[PDB]
mmCIF file of all heavy atoms in Angstrom:
data_model
loop_
_atom_site.group_PDB
_atom_site.id
_atom_site.type_symbol
_atom_site.label_atom_id
_atom_site.label_comp_id
_atom_site.label_asym_id
_atom_site.label_seq_id
_atom_site.Cartn_x
_atom_site.Cartn_y
_atom_site.Cartn_z
ATOM 1 N N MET X 532 18.454 -26.695 -83.194
ATOM 2 C CA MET X 532 17.776 -27.368 -82.042
ATOM 3 C C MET X 532 17.201 -28.728 -82.483
ATOM 4 O O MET X 532 17.096 -29.672 -81.651
ATOM 5 C CB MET X 532 16.657 -26.510 -81.446
ATOM 6 C CG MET X 532 17.160 -25.428 -80.481
ATOM 7 S SD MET X 532 18.347 -26.039 -79.211
ATOM 8 C CE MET X 532 19.905 -25.412 -79.853
ATOM 9 N N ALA X 533 16.817 -28.855 -83.750
ATOM 10 C CA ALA X 533 16.300 -30.128 -84.304
ATOM 11 C C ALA X 533 16.833 -30.283 -85.720
ATOM 12 O O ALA X 533 16.117 -30.074 -86.699
ATOM 13 C CB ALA X 533 14.795 -30.186 -84.271
ATOM 14 N N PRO X 534 18.116 -30.654 -85.848
ATOM 15 C CA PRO X 534 18.771 -30.651 -87.160
ATOM 16 C C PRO X 534 17.889 -31.307 -88.229
ATOM 17 O O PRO X 534 17.373 -32.398 -88.017
ATOM 18 C CB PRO X 534 20.017 -31.453 -86.909
ATOM 19 C CG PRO X 534 20.327 -31.252 -85.441
ATOM 20 C CD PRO X 534 19.001 -31.061 -84.752
ATOM 21 N N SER X 535 17.721 -30.643 -89.374
ATOM 22 C CA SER X 535 16.784 -31.058 -90.433
ATOM 23 C C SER X 535 17.466 -30.978 -91.798
ATOM 24 O O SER X 535 18.530 -30.343 -91.920
ATOM 25 C CB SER X 535 15.521 -30.241 -90.443
ATOM 26 O OG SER X 535 15.757 -28.893 -90.820
ATOM 27 N N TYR X 536 16.847 -31.626 -92.774
ATOM 28 C CA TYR X 536 17.130 -31.423 -94.208
ATOM 29 C C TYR X 536 15.893 -30.818 -94.846
ATOM 30 O O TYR X 536 14.728 -31.233 -94.556
ATOM 31 C CB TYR X 536 17.395 -32.731 -94.954
ATOM 32 C CG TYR X 536 18.708 -33.380 -94.615
ATOM 33 C CD1 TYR X 536 18.794 -34.501 -93.828
ATOM 34 C CD2 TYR X 536 19.883 -32.929 -95.214
ATOM 35 C CE1 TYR X 536 19.997 -35.170 -93.607
ATOM 36 C CE2 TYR X 536 21.099 -33.537 -94.958
ATOM 37 C CZ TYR X 536 21.168 -34.660 -94.153
ATOM 38 O OH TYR X 536 22.371 -35.294 -93.956
ATOM 39 N N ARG X 537 16.116 -29.833 -95.710
ATOM 40 C CA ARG X 537 15.053 -29.227 -96.546
ATOM 41 C C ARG X 537 15.573 -29.123 -97.974
ATOM 42 O O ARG X 537 16.800 -29.135 -98.150
ATOM 43 C CB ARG X 537 14.688 -27.820 -96.069
ATOM 44 C CG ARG X 537 13.942 -27.736 -94.749
ATOM 45 C CD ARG X 537 13.850 -26.276 -94.327
ATOM 46 N NE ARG X 537 15.011 -25.815 -93.571
ATOM 47 C CZ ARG X 537 15.357 -24.543 -93.379
ATOM 48 N NH1 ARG X 537 14.649 -23.550 -93.899
ATOM 49 N NH2 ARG X 537 16.422 -24.265 -92.648
ATOM 50 N N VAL X 538 14.670 -28.948 -98.935
ATOM 51 C CA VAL X 538 15.065 -28.637 -100.315
ATOM 52 C C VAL X 538 14.310 -27.399 -100.741
ATOM 53 O O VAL X 538 13.114 -27.249 -100.394
ATOM 54 C CB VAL X 538 14.885 -29.827 -101.265
ATOM 55 C CG1 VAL X 538 13.463 -30.390 -101.266
ATOM 56 C CG2 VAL X 538 15.284 -29.406 -102.638
ATOM 57 N N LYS X 539 15.019 -26.485 -101.413
ATOM 58 C CA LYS X 539 14.454 -25.263 -102.046
ATOM 59 C C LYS X 539 14.796 -25.288 -103.535
ATOM 60 O O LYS X 539 15.928 -25.692 -103.873
ATOM 61 C CB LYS X 539 14.998 -23.993 -101.379
ATOM 62 C CG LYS X 539 14.661 -23.862 -99.897
ATOM 63 C CD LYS X 539 15.287 -22.667 -99.221
ATOM 64 C CE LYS X 539 14.949 -22.522 -97.750
ATOM 65 N NZ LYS X 539 15.676 -21.379 -97.141
ATOM 66 N N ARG X 540 13.829 -24.919 -104.386
ATOM 67 C CA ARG X 540 14.053 -24.769 -105.835
ATOM 68 C C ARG X 540 14.198 -23.281 -106.127
ATOM 69 O O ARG X 540 13.185 -22.576 -106.394
ATOM 70 C CB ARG X 540 12.927 -25.431 -106.625
ATOM 71 C CG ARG X 540 13.214 -25.438 -108.116
ATOM 72 C CD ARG X 540 12.027 -26.055 -108.815
ATOM 73 N NE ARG X 540 11.013 -25.051 -108.995
ATOM 74 C CZ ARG X 540 10.938 -24.244 -110.048
ATOM 75 N NH1 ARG X 540 11.817 -24.342 -111.027
ATOM 76 N NH2 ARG X 540 9.958 -23.372 -110.122
ATOM 77 N N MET X 541 15.426 -22.810 -106.100
ATOM 78 C CA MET X 541 15.758 -21.384 -106.294
ATOM 79 C C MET X 541 17.274 -21.256 -106.382
ATOM 80 O O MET X 541 18.011 -22.249 -106.087
ATOM 81 C CB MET X 541 15.205 -20.558 -105.129
ATOM 82 C CG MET X 541 15.758 -20.961 -103.810
ATOM 83 S SD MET X 541 15.037 -19.943 -102.426
ATOM 84 C CE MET X 541 15.854 -18.426 -102.713
ATOM 85 N N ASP X 542 17.711 -20.072 -106.746
ATOM 86 C CA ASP X 542 19.121 -19.673 -106.815
ATOM 87 C C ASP X 542 19.749 -19.700 -105.424
ATOM 88 O O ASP X 542 19.301 -18.964 -104.505
ATOM 89 C CB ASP X 542 19.243 -18.274 -107.402
ATOM 90 C CG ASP X 542 20.643 -17.798 -107.675
ATOM 91 O OD1 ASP X 542 21.643 -18.510 -107.324
ATOM 92 O OD2 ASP X 542 20.729 -16.742 -108.385
ATOM 93 N N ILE X 543 20.780 -20.521 -105.244
ATOM 94 C CA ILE X 543 21.499 -20.629 -103.941
ATOM 95 C C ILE X 543 22.159 -19.300 -103.562
ATOM 96 O O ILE X 543 22.468 -19.122 -102.381
ATOM 97 C CB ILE X 543 22.504 -21.792 -104.033
ATOM 98 C CG1 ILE X 543 22.982 -22.215 -102.661
ATOM 99 C CG2 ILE X 543 23.680 -21.423 -104.925
ATOM 100 C CD1 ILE X 543 23.824 -23.465 -102.696
ATOM 101 N N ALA X 544 22.395 -18.381 -104.506
ATOM 102 C CA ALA X 544 22.885 -17.029 -104.206
ATOM 103 C C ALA X 544 21.874 -16.227 -103.374
ATOM 104 O O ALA X 544 22.297 -15.188 -102.866
ATOM 105 C CB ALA X 544 23.206 -16.282 -105.477
ATOM 106 N N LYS X 545 20.629 -16.663 -103.266
ATOM 107 C CA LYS X 545 19.541 -15.993 -102.528
ATOM 108 C C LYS X 545 19.304 -16.796 -101.234
ATOM 109 O O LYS X 545 18.218 -16.657 -100.647
ATOM 110 C CB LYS X 545 18.228 -15.917 -103.333
ATOM 111 C CG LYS X 545 18.196 -15.211 -104.701
ATOM 112 C CD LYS X 545 16.796 -15.356 -105.380
ATOM 113 C CE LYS X 545 16.548 -14.535 -106.641
ATOM 114 N NZ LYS X 545 15.183 -14.780 -107.215
ATOM 115 N N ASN X 546 20.220 -17.657 -100.779
ATOM 116 C CA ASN X 546 19.913 -18.570 -99.658
ATOM 117 C C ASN X 546 19.663 -17.802 -98.353
ATOM 118 O O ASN X 546 20.194 -16.686 -98.189
ATOM 119 C CB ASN X 546 21.024 -19.609 -99.418
ATOM 120 C CG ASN X 546 22.260 -19.044 -98.754
ATOM 121 O OD1 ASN X 546 22.290 -18.846 -97.545
ATOM 122 N ND2 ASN X 546 23.317 -18.821 -99.543
ATOM 123 N N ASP X 547 18.997 -18.470 -97.431
ATOM 124 C CA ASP X 547 18.646 -17.968 -96.081
ATOM 125 C C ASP X 547 19.451 -18.679 -94.998
ATOM 126 O O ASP X 547 18.942 -18.800 -93.846
ATOM 127 C CB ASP X 547 17.154 -18.134 -95.855
ATOM 128 C CG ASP X 547 16.576 -17.311 -94.719
ATOM 129 O OD1 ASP X 547 17.176 -16.268 -94.337
ATOM 130 O OD2 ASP X 547 15.570 -17.772 -94.184
ATOM 131 N N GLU X 548 20.655 -19.142 -95.332
ATOM 132 C CA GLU X 548 21.465 -19.923 -94.387
ATOM 133 C C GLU X 548 22.736 -19.191 -93.975
ATOM 134 O O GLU X 548 23.074 -18.162 -94.523
ATOM 135 C CB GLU X 548 21.742 -21.314 -94.925
ATOM 136 C CG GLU X 548 20.500 -22.174 -94.938
ATOM 137 C CD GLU X 548 19.535 -21.837 -96.055
ATOM 138 O OE1 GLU X 548 19.975 -21.831 -97.232
ATOM 139 O OE2 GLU X 548 18.342 -21.536 -95.761
ATOM 140 N N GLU X 549 23.432 -19.723 -92.974
ATOM 141 C CA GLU X 549 24.591 -19.018 -92.362
ATOM 142 C C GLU X 549 25.877 -19.166 -93.175
ATOM 143 O O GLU X 549 26.850 -18.485 -92.882
ATOM 144 C CB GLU X 549 24.827 -19.517 -90.942
ATOM 145 C CG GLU X 549 23.699 -19.122 -90.042
ATOM 146 C CD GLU X 549 23.883 -19.492 -88.591
ATOM 147 O OE1 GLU X 549 24.889 -20.154 -88.259
ATOM 148 O OE2 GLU X 549 23.009 -19.098 -87.814
ATOM 149 N N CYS X 550 25.885 -20.029 -94.187
ATOM 150 C CA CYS X 550 27.048 -20.210 -95.075
ATOM 151 C C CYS X 550 26.553 -20.942 -96.321
ATOM 152 O O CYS X 550 25.423 -21.498 -96.337
ATOM 153 C CB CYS X 550 28.196 -20.939 -94.393
ATOM 154 S SG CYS X 550 27.849 -22.675 -94.044
ATOM 155 N N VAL X 551 27.369 -20.924 -97.353
ATOM 156 C CA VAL X 551 27.006 -21.518 -98.654
ATOM 157 C C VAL X 551 28.130 -22.433 -99.093
ATOM 158 O O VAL X 551 29.298 -22.158 -98.818
ATOM 159 C CB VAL X 551 26.721 -20.439 -99.704
ATOM 160 C CG1 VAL X 551 27.980 -19.667 -100.095
ATOM 161 C CG2 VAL X 551 26.014 -21.001 -100.927
ATOM 162 N N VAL X 552 27.759 -23.514 -99.729
ATOM 163 C CA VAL X 552 28.728 -24.388 -100.449
ATOM 164 C C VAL X 552 28.657 -24.022 -101.915
ATOM 165 O O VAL X 552 27.567 -24.075 -102.539
ATOM 166 C CB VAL X 552 28.355 -25.863 -100.226
ATOM 167 C CG1 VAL X 552 29.256 -26.739 -101.078
ATOM 168 C CG2 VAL X 552 28.422 -26.250 -98.778
ATOM 169 N N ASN X 553 29.796 -23.660 -102.461
ATOM 170 C CA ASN X 553 29.915 -23.449 -103.915
ATOM 171 C C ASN X 553 30.228 -24.777 -104.597
ATOM 172 O O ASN X 553 31.111 -25.502 -104.111
ATOM 173 C CB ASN X 553 31.018 -22.448 -104.230
ATOM 174 C CG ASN X 553 31.133 -22.111 -105.687
ATOM 175 O OD1 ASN X 553 30.188 -22.263 -106.419
ATOM 176 N ND2 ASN X 553 32.294 -21.646 -106.071
ATOM 177 N N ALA X 554 29.574 -25.067 -105.722
ATOM 178 C CA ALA X 554 29.968 -26.186 -106.623
ATOM 179 C C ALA X 554 31.111 -25.636 -107.484
ATOM 180 O O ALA X 554 30.872 -25.166 -108.600
ATOM 181 C CB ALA X 554 28.782 -26.630 -107.414
ATOM 182 N N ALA X 555 32.292 -25.611 -106.909
ATOM 183 C CA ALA X 555 33.472 -24.920 -107.463
ATOM 184 C C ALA X 555 34.196 -25.766 -108.524
ATOM 185 O O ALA X 555 34.048 -26.997 -108.595
ATOM 186 C CB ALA X 555 34.443 -24.604 -106.361
ATOM 187 N N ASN X 556 35.047 -25.059 -109.280
ATOM 188 C CA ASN X 556 36.052 -25.729 -110.120
ATOM 189 C C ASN X 556 37.361 -25.713 -109.378
ATOM 190 O O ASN X 556 37.534 -24.939 -108.434
ATOM 191 C CB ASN X 556 36.173 -25.132 -111.512
ATOM 192 C CG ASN X 556 36.460 -23.660 -111.485
ATOM 193 O OD1 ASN X 556 37.586 -23.273 -111.176
ATOM 194 N ND2 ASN X 556 35.433 -22.850 -111.736
ATOM 195 N N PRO X 557 38.306 -26.580 -109.754
ATOM 196 C CA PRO X 557 39.549 -26.670 -109.011
ATOM 197 C C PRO X 557 40.415 -25.415 -109.028
ATOM 198 O O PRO X 557 41.271 -25.306 -108.205
ATOM 199 C CB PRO X 557 40.323 -27.804 -109.705
ATOM 200 C CG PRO X 557 39.342 -28.508 -110.564
ATOM 201 C CD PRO X 557 38.216 -27.559 -110.846
ATOM 202 N N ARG X 558 40.211 -24.531 -109.984
ATOM 203 C CA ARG X 558 41.107 -23.376 -110.252
ATOM 204 C C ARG X 558 40.567 -22.096 -109.659
ATOM 205 O O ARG X 558 41.236 -21.054 -109.804
ATOM 206 C CB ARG X 558 41.293 -23.258 -111.761
ATOM 207 C CG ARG X 558 41.838 -24.575 -112.295
ATOM 208 C CD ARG X 558 42.049 -24.539 -113.788
ATOM 209 N NE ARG X 558 42.603 -25.849 -114.076
ATOM 210 C CZ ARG X 558 43.890 -26.201 -113.961
ATOM 211 N NH1 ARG X 558 44.838 -25.334 -113.640
ATOM 212 N NH2 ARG X 558 44.219 -27.443 -114.197
ATOM 213 N N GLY X 559 39.444 -22.161 -108.945
ATOM 214 C CA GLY X 559 38.835 -20.949 -108.390
ATOM 215 C C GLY X 559 38.426 -19.942 -109.448
ATOM 216 O O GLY X 559 38.465 -18.733 -109.179
ATOM 217 N N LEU X 560 38.017 -20.407 -110.619
ATOM 218 C CA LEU X 560 37.493 -19.555 -111.716
ATOM 219 C C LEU X 560 36.012 -19.292 -111.538
ATOM 220 O O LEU X 560 35.313 -20.082 -110.890
ATOM 221 C CB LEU X 560 37.753 -20.279 -113.037
ATOM 222 C CG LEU X 560 39.212 -20.418 -113.444
ATOM 223 C CD1 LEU X 560 39.342 -21.543 -114.468
ATOM 224 C CD2 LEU X 560 39.746 -19.140 -114.055
ATOM 225 N N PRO X 561 35.475 -18.197 -112.109
ATOM 226 C CA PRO X 561 34.042 -17.911 -112.041
ATOM 227 C C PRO X 561 33.128 -19.019 -112.538
ATOM 228 O O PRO X 561 32.071 -19.189 -111.972
ATOM 229 C CB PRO X 561 33.888 -16.643 -112.896
ATOM 230 C CG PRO X 561 35.235 -15.977 -112.770
ATOM 231 C CD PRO X 561 36.224 -17.124 -112.799
ATOM 232 N N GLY X 562 33.518 -19.764 -113.577
ATOM 233 C CA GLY X 562 32.734 -20.950 -113.980
ATOM 234 C C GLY X 562 31.359 -20.636 -114.552
ATOM 235 O O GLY X 562 31.151 -19.500 -115.032
ATOM 236 N N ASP X 563 30.441 -21.592 -114.416
ATOM 237 C CA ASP X 563 29.036 -21.556 -114.890
ATOM 238 C C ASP X 563 28.074 -22.085 -113.831
ATOM 239 O O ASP X 563 28.519 -22.686 -112.836
ATOM 240 C CB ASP X 563 28.886 -22.471 -116.107
ATOM 241 C CG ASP X 563 29.864 -22.090 -117.189
ATOM 242 O OD1 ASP X 563 29.718 -20.963 -117.719
ATOM 243 O OD2 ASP X 563 30.792 -22.895 -117.448
ATOM 244 N N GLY X 564 26.780 -21.878 -114.034
ATOM 245 C CA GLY X 564 25.754 -22.506 -113.177
ATOM 246 C C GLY X 564 25.856 -21.967 -111.750
ATOM 247 O O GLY X 564 26.094 -20.763 -111.603
ATOM 248 N N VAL X 565 25.736 -22.827 -110.738
ATOM 249 C CA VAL X 565 25.868 -22.385 -109.310
ATOM 250 C C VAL X 565 27.158 -21.557 -109.144
ATOM 251 O O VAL X 565 27.114 -20.461 -108.510
ATOM 252 C CB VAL X 565 25.831 -23.557 -108.315
ATOM 253 C CG1 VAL X 565 26.473 -23.173 -106.988
ATOM 254 C CG2 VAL X 565 24.416 -24.082 -108.086
ATOM 255 N N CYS X 566 28.284 -22.000 -109.714
ATOM 256 C CA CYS X 566 29.595 -21.328 -109.503
ATOM 257 C C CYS X 566 29.514 -19.867 -109.977
ATOM 258 O O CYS X 566 30.062 -18.965 -109.300
ATOM 259 C CB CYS X 566 30.734 -22.113 -110.146
ATOM 260 S SG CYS X 566 32.377 -21.535 -109.659
ATOM 261 N N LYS X 567 28.885 -19.626 -111.119
ATOM 262 C CA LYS X 567 28.797 -18.235 -111.651
ATOM 263 C C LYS X 567 27.929 -17.350 -110.737
ATOM 264 O O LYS X 567 28.270 -16.141 -110.548
ATOM 265 C CB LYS X 567 28.180 -18.250 -113.045
ATOM 266 C CG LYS X 567 28.053 -16.889 -113.705
ATOM 267 C CD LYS X 567 29.300 -16.040 -113.625
ATOM 268 C CE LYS X 567 30.499 -16.735 -114.233
ATOM 269 N NZ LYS X 567 31.408 -15.783 -114.914
ATOM 270 N N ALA X 568 26.825 -17.897 -110.248
ATOM 271 C CA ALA X 568 25.898 -17.178 -109.334
ATOM 272 C C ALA X 568 26.682 -16.810 -108.071
ATOM 273 O O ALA X 568 26.459 -15.714 -107.492
ATOM 274 C CB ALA X 568 24.685 -18.031 -109.009
ATOM 275 N N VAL X 569 27.428 -17.777 -107.544
ATOM 276 C CA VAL X 569 28.247 -17.587 -106.318
ATOM 277 C C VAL X 569 29.280 -16.487 -106.591
ATOM 278 O O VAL X 569 29.505 -15.653 -105.745
ATOM 279 C CB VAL X 569 28.878 -18.927 -105.888
ATOM 280 C CG1 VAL X 569 29.902 -18.758 -104.809
ATOM 281 C CG2 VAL X 569 27.826 -19.919 -105.442
ATOM 282 N N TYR X 570 29.916 -16.497 -107.771
ATOM 283 C CA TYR X 570 30.929 -15.493 -108.120
ATOM 284 C C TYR X 570 30.294 -14.094 -108.181
ATOM 285 O O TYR X 570 30.951 -13.160 -107.698
ATOM 286 C CB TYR X 570 31.565 -15.849 -109.459
ATOM 287 C CG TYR X 570 32.642 -14.855 -109.813
ATOM 288 C CD1 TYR X 570 33.850 -14.849 -109.146
ATOM 289 C CD2 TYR X 570 32.421 -13.872 -110.766
ATOM 290 C CE1 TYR X 570 34.837 -13.917 -109.423
ATOM 291 C CE2 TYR X 570 33.399 -12.933 -111.060
ATOM 292 C CZ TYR X 570 34.593 -12.936 -110.363
ATOM 293 O OH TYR X 570 35.589 -12.051 -110.636
ATOM 294 N N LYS X 571 29.083 -13.969 -108.704
ATOM 295 C CA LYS X 571 28.360 -12.662 -108.786
ATOM 296 C C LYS X 571 28.010 -12.140 -107.382
ATOM 297 O O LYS X 571 28.124 -10.889 -107.107
ATOM 298 C CB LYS X 571 27.086 -12.789 -109.621
ATOM 299 C CG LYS X 571 27.315 -12.887 -111.124
ATOM 300 C CD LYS X 571 26.244 -12.168 -111.926
ATOM 301 C CE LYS X 571 26.515 -12.170 -113.416
ATOM 302 N NZ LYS X 571 26.286 -13.509 -114.019
ATOM 303 N N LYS X 572 27.584 -13.035 -106.503
ATOM 304 C CA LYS X 572 27.089 -12.646 -105.164
ATOM 305 C C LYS X 572 28.266 -12.409 -104.211
ATOM 306 O O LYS X 572 28.166 -11.500 -103.365
ATOM 307 C CB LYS X 572 26.128 -13.705 -104.609
ATOM 308 C CG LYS X 572 25.533 -13.375 -103.233
ATOM 309 C CD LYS X 572 24.720 -12.097 -103.238
ATOM 310 C CE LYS X 572 23.549 -12.099 -104.210
ATOM 311 N NZ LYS X 572 22.736 -10.850 -104.108
ATOM 312 N N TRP X 573 29.278 -13.271 -104.231
ATOM 313 C CA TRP X 573 30.378 -13.269 -103.261
ATOM 314 C C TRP X 573 31.722 -13.282 -103.970
ATOM 315 O O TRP X 573 32.563 -14.150 -103.731
ATOM 316 C CB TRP X 573 30.257 -14.450 -102.280
ATOM 317 C CG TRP X 573 28.966 -14.571 -101.520
ATOM 318 C CD1 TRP X 573 28.553 -13.802 -100.464
ATOM 319 C CD2 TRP X 573 27.892 -15.491 -101.769
ATOM 320 N NE1 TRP X 573 27.325 -14.203 -100.031
ATOM 321 C CE2 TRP X 573 26.890 -15.235 -100.808
ATOM 322 C CE3 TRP X 573 27.688 -16.533 -102.680
ATOM 323 C CZ2 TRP X 573 25.738 -16.001 -100.725
ATOM 324 C CZ3 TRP X 573 26.527 -17.253 -102.629
ATOM 325 C CH2 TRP X 573 25.577 -17.004 -101.657
ATOM 326 N N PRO X 574 32.033 -12.340 -104.881
ATOM 327 C CA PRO X 574 33.290 -12.441 -105.635
ATOM 328 C C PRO X 574 34.555 -12.410 -104.784
ATOM 329 O O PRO X 574 35.556 -13.068 -105.102
ATOM 330 C CB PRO X 574 33.258 -11.184 -106.536
ATOM 331 C CG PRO X 574 32.286 -10.240 -105.820
ATOM 332 C CD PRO X 574 31.221 -11.167 -105.255
ATOM 333 N N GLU X 575 34.495 -11.744 -103.632
ATOM 334 C CA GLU X 575 35.632 -11.664 -102.680
ATOM 335 C C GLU X 575 36.030 -13.070 -102.199
ATOM 336 O O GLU X 575 37.173 -13.260 -101.808
ATOM 337 C CB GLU X 575 35.294 -10.754 -101.489
ATOM 338 C CG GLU X 575 34.938 -9.295 -101.864
ATOM 339 C CD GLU X 575 33.485 -8.999 -102.217
ATOM 340 O OE1 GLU X 575 32.706 -9.935 -102.436
ATOM 341 O OE2 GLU X 575 33.091 -7.793 -102.289
ATOM 342 N N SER X 576 35.089 -14.020 -102.167
ATOM 343 C CA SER X 576 35.368 -15.382 -101.675
ATOM 344 C C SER X 576 36.213 -16.180 -102.667
ATOM 345 O O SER X 576 36.662 -17.259 -102.271
ATOM 346 C CB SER X 576 34.099 -16.112 -101.367
ATOM 347 O OG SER X 576 33.427 -16.532 -102.518
#
């Protein structure tokens, strides 16, 4: 209703939003950092 920007200092795997952007590698590997957290939470993706 009032599009906004916010910042949170926490694991994006714990987000409160309707979708997530992964900081992915080109090969769709589990990776490190945000990518590894995303792989643990949503491995099917």
Side-chain angles (χ1 to χ4, degrees):
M532 279 311 105
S535 67
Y536 289 106
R537 290 171 273 162
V538 55
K539 299 176 180 176
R540 187 182 83 88
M541 60 181 287
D542 187 355
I543 196 172
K545 302 175 171 179
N546 75 79
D547 197 23
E548 290 76 54
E549 293 184 356
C550 69
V551 68
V552 174
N553 184 23
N556 56 74
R558 303 180 178 277
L560 293 160
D563 304 295
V565 159
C566 191
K567 181 47 57 145
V569 170
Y570 182 73
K571 285 216 176 73
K572 181 61 59 176
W573 305 285
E575 301 87 347
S576 75

